[PDB]
Amino acid sequence: NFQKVEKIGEGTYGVVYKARNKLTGEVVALKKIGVPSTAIREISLLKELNHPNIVKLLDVIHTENKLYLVFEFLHQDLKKFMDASALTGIPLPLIKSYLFQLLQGLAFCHSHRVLHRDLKPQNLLINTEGAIKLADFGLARAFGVPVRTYTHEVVTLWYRAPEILLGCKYYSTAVDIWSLGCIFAEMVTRRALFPGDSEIDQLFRIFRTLGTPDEVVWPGVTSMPDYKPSFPKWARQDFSKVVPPLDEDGRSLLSQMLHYDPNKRISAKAALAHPFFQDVTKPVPHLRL
Numbered sequence: 001n002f003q004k005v006e007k008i009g010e011g012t013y014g015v016v017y018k019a020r021n022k023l024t025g026e027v028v029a030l031k032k033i034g035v036p037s038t039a040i041r042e043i044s045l046l047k048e049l050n051h052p053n054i055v056k057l058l059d060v061i062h063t064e065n066k067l068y069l070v071f072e073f074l075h076q077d078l079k080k081f082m083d084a085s086a087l088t089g090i091p092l093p094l095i096k097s098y099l100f101q102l103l104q105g106l107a108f109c110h111s112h113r114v115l116h117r118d119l120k121p122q123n124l125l126i127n128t129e130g131a132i133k134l135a136d137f138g139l140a141r142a143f144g145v146p147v148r149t150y151t152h153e154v155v156t157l158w159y160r161a162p163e164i165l166l167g168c169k170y171y172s173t174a175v176d177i178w179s180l181g182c183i184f185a186e187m188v189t190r191r192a193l194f195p196g197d198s199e200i201d202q203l204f205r206i207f208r209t210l211g212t213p214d215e216v217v218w219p220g221v222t223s224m225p226d227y228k229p230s231f232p233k234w235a236r237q238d239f240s241k242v243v244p245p246l247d248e249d250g251r252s253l254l255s256q257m258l259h260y261d262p263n264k265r266i267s268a269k270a271a272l273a274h275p276f277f278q279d280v281t282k283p284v285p286h287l288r289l
């Protein structure tokens with residue numbers, strides 16, 4: 001039903017193509033992943049979870065022991081945009097608008113009790129209208145998040161919340177707040193905040209910046225499955241050192257998004273109310289297509 005126009009990239013679950021609907025001219029992104037019917041039932045329910053900051057899921061097609069997901073197509077991703085902005089950075093009003101829009105996307109999904117679980121710049125997609133959109137929402141619950149992609153590329157740990165790294169089995173909406181916080185910091189500084197290259201390196205990078213967590217800041221932490229008394233005990237650093245030249249409001253929100261305790265970490269809804277968004281607007285990015 002579709003002719004491929006070009007390879008878009010390799011996703012966690014399979015290859016993604018820009019394609020034109022061979023009869024209707026419609027340009028879409030087709031993601032190609034026999035599948036368990038649990039994964040079919042779950043994915044199908046996502047066709048209803050529509051929001052302007054969630055990439056629209058157009059169709060799910062189960063055929064020939066393969067699964068195709070047909071999505072609306074966006075022309076750029078946030079990872080590419082950040083690399084393209086390396087030399088001068090993303091201007092603050094655009095960072096602010098993108099953070100605000102993503103939190104609206106989270107507030108929506110969270111309200112329907114759906115989490116993403118694997119937010120990263122690769123799956124935040126942007127258009128010429130100044131919009132940014134969450135892709136892959138809901139796919140982690142459907143297939144798990146594995147250690148490597150189907151092409152054996154490493155699944156990044158850089159945005160993983162510490163409760164997940166600490167072996168927690170039942171994680172909450174707060175894991176998406178943690179990742180988005182990490183992505184916010186990386187847009188501001190132009191460098192990944194916690195670029196771990198193993199689970200313990202990712203944990204220790206977290207502890208080196210935010211302090212080794214203990215029962216004072218996180219009740220129950222010492223009881224988590226992968227917690228070890230023998231973790232080195234690092235002191236917390238100042239956010240003023242971590243994401244200069246972010247302003248006091250943005251530092252305050254960041255600090256709330258990166259609370260160790262997922263019960264104390266700010267909600268997407270609360271975050272939309274933060275003073276940081278007092279003067280939020282919607283600029284246009286410059287994109288070369």
Ligand SMILES: CC(C)c1cnn2c(NCc3ccccc3)cc(N[C@@H](CO)[C@H](O)CO)nc12
Pocket residue numbers: 007008009010011012016018029030031055071072073074075076077122123125135136
């Ligand atoms: C499939 C749909 C969400 C979807 C819709 N657009 N799109 C883009 N657009 C940006 C782009 C990048 C290169 C060439 C042309 C456009 C990248 C992408 N990336 C995949 C793979 O890199 C990621 O898995 C997030 O879905 N997935 C998608």
